[PDB]
């Protein structure tokens, strides 16, 4: 469907623009160049890859074009790896902020620049390990020896429900939920030391982080559980699939905003960049 393709392409553009802008801001601004933002830049890097590589590959999987089954599995697996890294790099930010709020003194002694690279590498090795698991044999595998290249044709739903949804969406969501509720509690404690309007604002801001992650990722994976556990049910309609797939990719558009745009230092840097680009054409 044309609507799916173009909406999907819009998001890819918006994903590249917003995340390059985040990355560019860290390169220019000297104050943004510190260990805590390694996690933001890794996230932003992953989201660019989602826009450039993962979404175009996801578009191809929608067409059911003719290809060798194991070629089709490789493309589907590549979409999984890149989206997984986006989710795991997102989790890394929450683990960082958890250490920061729970163990605030040792933070600088625990969270070193080298150890942060360790964490980021683990995020990407876990992405490959999990997203390429179907290539190792756990799969459902035009001229002879070719098939219609579709996602649910090559990637088994037991993998998606028992391993992928559990490991890559549900656990992260639960961890993030738990982490941000503990950070909120610390904020409300310190607010009391120094207006419940300020507490409500804080609660709202952390609700938005976890709420958006759940809004983006749960629809498609909830639907996948429905598909897996009810093989007798008529399958979810194709417009709903396109909606849910699109929603999952739209995490990469809002991930810039909520994370980076919640830092004043990023916000001011964005002004100076857009302004100095317009001052540049109008001389």
């Amino acid at each position: 469907s044309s609507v799916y393709i173009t909406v999907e392409l819009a998001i890819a553009v918006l994903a590249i623009l917003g995340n390059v802008l985040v990355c560019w801001a860290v390169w220019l601004n000297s104050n943004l160049q510190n260990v805590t933002n390694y996690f933001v830049v890794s996230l932003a890097a992953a989201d660019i890859a989602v826009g450039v590589l993962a979404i175009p590959f996801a578009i191809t999987i929608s067409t059911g074009f003719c290809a060798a089954c194991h070629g089709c599995l490789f493309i589907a697996c590549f979409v999984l790896v890149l989206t997984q890294s986006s989710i795991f790099s997102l989790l890394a930010i929450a683990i960082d902020r958890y250490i920061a709020i729970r163990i605030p003194l040792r933070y600088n002694g625990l969270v070193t620049g080298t150890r942060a690279k360790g964490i980021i590498a683990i995020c990407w090795v876990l992405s490959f390990a999990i997203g390429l698991t179907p290539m190792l044999g756990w799969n459902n595998c035009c001229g002879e020896g070719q098939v219609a290249c579709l996602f649910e044709d090559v990637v088994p739903m037991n993998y998606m429900v028992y391993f992928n949804f559990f490991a890559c969406v549900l656990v992260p969501l639960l961890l993030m939920l738990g982490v941000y509720l503990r950070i909120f509690l610390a904020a409300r404690r310190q607010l009391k030391q120094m207006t419940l309007q300020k507490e409500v604002h804080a609660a709202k801001s952390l609700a938005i982080i976890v709420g958006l992650f759940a809004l983006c990722w749960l629809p498609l994976h909830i639907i996948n559980c429905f598909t897996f556990f009810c093989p007798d049910c008529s399958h979810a309609p194709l417009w709903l699939m396109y909606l849910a797939i699109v929603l999952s990719h739209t995490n990469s558009v809002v991930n810039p905003f909520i994370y980076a745009y919640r830092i004043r230092e990023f916000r001011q840097t964005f002004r100076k960049i857009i302004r100095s680009h317009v001052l540049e054409n109008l001389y």
């Binding site: 610390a186 310190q190 830092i263």
Partner: protein, 196 residues
């Protein structure tokens, strides 16, 4: 390792607070190293050492609550520390010391604080104030009056980059310092996320 700046008047017990914990003093709490430096009074030794460092996590300020006259001196010194160009964003852990001796002074009745601080006559104990079991409301009132005398200064320049954490000290001072540093830097992270 967490750097601290210890300062306060002569006979403010600033030397005993560091004695119990054992000029340069490094102590261990909850497997977190601290490194304190003694540099105070306002007489001398302060302006030399203060302008070296920079990365002090917090300033420990000790005042004798019992010494009503030198309390005015201490208030001046505090105002100075609070508005100092080099220490503008540095948070102050405030020890109101010799509480026991204050209790004695106040219960005795010889010296009336209103003499040194007339606006005390129209001061009533705060509703939030949490006096301990067996504390004469008079002693509580005076104690909290001094505390508030130091706090009005903190709130005068109400920028909110830094804060003043008070204590009543007569046992466990190391833990108070620990907790206050923990709070300071945890609030630095909370501020960093605009969660403040």
């Amino acid at each position: 390792t967490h750097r601290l700046l210890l300062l306060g008047a002569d006979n403010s017990g600033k030397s005993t607070i560091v004695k119990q914990m054992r000029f340069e003093t490094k102590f261990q709490v909850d497997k977190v190293n601290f490194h304190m430096f003694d540099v105070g009074g306002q007489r001398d030794e302060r302006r030399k050492w203060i302008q070296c460092f920079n990365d002090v996590t917090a300033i420990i300020f000790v005042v004798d609550s019992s010494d009503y006259n030198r309390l005015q001196e201490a208030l001046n010194d505090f105002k100075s520390i609070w508005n100092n160009r080099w220490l503008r964003t540095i948070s102050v852990i405030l020890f109101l010391n010799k509480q026991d001796l204050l209790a004695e002074k106040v219960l005795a009745g010889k010296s009336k604080i209103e003499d040194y601080f007339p606006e005390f006559a129209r001061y009533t104990t705060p509703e939030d104030a949490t006096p301990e079991p067996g504390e004469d409301p008079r002693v509580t009132r005076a104690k909290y009056f001094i505390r508030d005398e130091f706090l009005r200064i903190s709130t005068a320049s109400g920028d909110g980059r830094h804060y003043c954490y008070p204590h009543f000290t007569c046992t466990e001072n190391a833990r108070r310092i620990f907790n206050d540093c923990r709070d300071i830097i945890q609030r630095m992270h909370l501020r960093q996320y605009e969660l403040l």
